[PDB]
Amino acid sequence: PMFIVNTNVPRASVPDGFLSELTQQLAQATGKPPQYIAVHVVPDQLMAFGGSSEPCALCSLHSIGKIGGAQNRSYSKLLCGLLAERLRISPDRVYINYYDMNAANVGWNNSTFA
Amino acid sequence: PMFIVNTNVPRASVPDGFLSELTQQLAQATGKPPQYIAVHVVPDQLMAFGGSSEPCALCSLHSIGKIGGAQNRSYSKLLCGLLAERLRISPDRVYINYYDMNAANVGWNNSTFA
Amino acid sequence: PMFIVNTNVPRASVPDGFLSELTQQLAQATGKPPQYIAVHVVPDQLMAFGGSSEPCALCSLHSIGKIGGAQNRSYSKLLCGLLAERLRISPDRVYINYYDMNAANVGWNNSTFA
Ligand SMILES: COc1ccc(N2Cc3ccc(O)cc3OC2=O)cc1
Ligand SMILES: COc1ccc(N2Cc3ccc(O)cc3OC2=O)cc1
Ligand SMILES: COc1ccc(N2Cc3ccc(O)cc3OC2=O)cc1
Numbered sequence: 001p002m003f004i005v006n007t008n009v010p011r012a013s014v015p016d017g018f019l020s021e022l023t024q025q026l027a028q029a030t031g032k033p034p035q036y037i038a039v040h041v042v043p044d045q046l047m048a049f050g051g052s053s054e055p056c057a058l059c060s061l062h063s064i065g066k067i068g069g070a071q072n073r074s075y076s077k078l079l080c081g082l083l084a085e086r087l088r089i090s091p092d093r094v095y096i097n098y099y100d101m102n103a104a105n106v107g108w109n110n111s112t113f114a
Numbered sequence: 115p116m117f118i119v120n121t122n123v124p125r126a127s128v129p130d131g132f133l134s135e136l137t138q139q140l141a142q143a144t145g146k147p148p149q150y151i152a153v154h155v156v157p158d159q160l161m162a163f164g165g166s167s168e169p170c171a172l173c174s175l176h177s178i179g180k181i182g183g184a185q186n187r188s189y190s191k192l193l194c195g196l197l198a199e200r201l202r203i204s205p206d207r208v209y210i211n212y213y214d215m216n217a218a219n220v221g222w223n224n225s226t227f228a
Numbered sequence: 229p230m231f232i233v234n235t236n237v238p239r240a241s242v243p244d245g246f247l248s249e250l251t252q253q254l255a256q257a258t259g260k261p262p263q264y265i266a267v268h269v270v271p272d273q274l275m276a277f278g279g280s281s282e283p284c285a286l287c288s289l290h291s292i293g294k295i296g297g298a299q300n301r302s303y304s305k306l307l308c309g310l311l312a313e314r315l316r317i318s319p320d321r322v323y324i325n326y327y328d329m330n331a332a333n334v335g336w337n338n339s340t341f342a
Pocket of ligand 2: 095096097115116146147150151176177178179215220227
């Protein structure tokens with residue numbers, strides 16, 4: 001999987017361990033081993049959510065399978081929990097876009113997963 | 115909805131008011147309530163369009179519905195007009211990717227919109 | 229097409245001309261005219277891949293058609309090759325997400341394609 005977070009929280013307020021925490025927790029939640037999981041956090045962003053510039057996050061989670069109605073409901077609890085605790089973002093200021101990727105449309109190591 | 119703009123124009127050329135203006139204009143264009151609209155502007159990017167580094171923008175608009183042939187033409191006129199007037203970007207150096215998101219694939223506040 | 233690379237390698241490590249090279253090589257690979265190819269490179273990112281903070285990249289290639297099984301394997305070879313030779317990123321630390329876009333969902337020049 002690949003998990004991306006864009007946030008207006010400043011870089012100094014992103015804990016140094018956050019990437020590693022996300023990687024480990026996503027491995028558990030998706031059932032995918034952590035060596036396959038990539039995480040990207042982008043702080044200091046110029047953003048607004050409902051017209052307000054209080055802390056917020058726009059995220060995406062891409063996975064080959066392990067995406068669906070029930071699974072996505074669970075991931076949102078996990079990820080809102082993490083963003084709330086580590087970045088102090090209110091969970092009603094978090095969007096997460098979920099993407100079920102076809103293996104043919106994911107490149108890696110000179111090839112694709114198809 | 116959520117609207118993201120990535121651009122090579124400098125941060126100082128982004129008007130005060132710009133995020134609020136996008137929020138309001140998108141509320142009106144989509145009919146969606148402004149409290150659920152997120153906007154994200156990323157200036158100072160290293161970009162090329164047609165191999166040229168003149169002002170350009172790469173954007174995305176995600177919505178649960180309100181996406182399609184005619185609506186997307188209307189959004190493009192709206193949003194290129196805004197990028198031209200406020201950021202001085204020529205409409206032929208703007209791409210906007212539209213995404214009709216399934217509600218089950220949009221997480222918010224410990225759940226999804228499904 | 230549009231091609232986006234996010235990487236933790238420093239800005240100084242991106243060689244002069246890299247966005248021109250990507251534009252030219254993507255024109256040859258996709259058959260699309262270079263004047264319509266957009267490229268966006270984002271260095272100095274906070275990222276991890278498999279829990280390691282060693283050089284890595286997360287990319288996307290969007291195209292209206294010219295996306296599929298064999299074509300994507302060819303794009304991955306090309307692009308991993310360039311990231312390795314120009315940015316010194318190991319191909320096994322690169323993910324590329326491929327998107328076949330509907331023309332009606334791509335805005336440009338105050339309208340959309342068809
Ligand atoms: C070999 O096992 C695996 C395990 C996980 C994956 N990956 C890696 C991956 C990369 C990009 C992306 O958009 C989604 C994505 O999701 C997966 O399931 C790929 C192969
Ligand atoms: C008032 O109810 C609403 C209004 C708007 C929405 N949202 C929010 C939203 C978030 C992420 C995304 O990718 C798309 C998206 O589109 C919507 O329609 C959801 C519920
Ligand atoms: C010369 O005519 C052309 C050449 C290329 C395109 N484009 C531009 C483009 C923009 C955004 C995007 O997500 C995909 C995309 O793919 C294309 O094929 C469209 C028309």
